[PDB]
């Protein structure tokens, strides 16, 4: 529940592998580049950035947050992070047809099928799926996510976040 500190070493361009987004006057991780310093320290889509080099991110635009990263002095950048504050976990069971009960597209839940396990569990639409049974699906194509779901056993645990 508490904030954590990460320390990241810049590439030659001064970059650490992140794109950020302003939401509700906070700053959140939007994209993490593969095999970057940011990836290594476990930054993920949805994490909240409270400080960069000890300076509060409150009310910053994403362009401002990026500029702060670009202009940062020295070969390491420190950030204070609140781990995915919008994350929730939902567990569903496949029915006789192998479905848990929702329509999905572009990473997002769009409909809940009547009297399915998704319905019983109160799954919500306009939510992105982050993980399925421990497998991170951020950045995966829908067809890859469909394979993870097909091959899953009956019990399907997903983590979701509202699509802000």
């Amino acid at each position: 529940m508490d904030p954590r500190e990460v320390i990241l070493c810049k590439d030659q361009d001064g970059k650490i592998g992140l794109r950020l987004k302003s939401i509700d006057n906070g700053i959140f991780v939007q994209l993490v580049q593969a095999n970057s310093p940011a990836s290594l320290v476990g930054l993920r889509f949805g994490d909240q950035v409270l400080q960069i080099n000890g300076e509060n991110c409150a009310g910053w635009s994403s362009d401002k947050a990026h500029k702060v990263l670009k202009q940062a002095f020295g070969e390491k950048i420190t950030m204070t992070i609140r781990d995915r504050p919008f994350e929730r976990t939902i567990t569903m069971h496949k029915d006789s047809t192998g479905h848990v009960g929702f329509i999905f597209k572009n990473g997002k839940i769009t409909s809940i099928v009547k009297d399915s396990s998704a319905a019983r569990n109160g799954l919500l639409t306009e939510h992105n799926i982050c993980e399925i049974n421990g497998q991170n699906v951020i950045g995966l194509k829908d067809s890859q996510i469909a394979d993870i779901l097909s091959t899953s056993g009956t019990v399907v645990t997903i983590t979701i976040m509202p699509a802000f």
Partner: peptide, 4 residues
């Protein structure tokens, strides 16, 4: 140029 779009990543930082």
């Amino acid at each position: 140029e779009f990543y930082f």
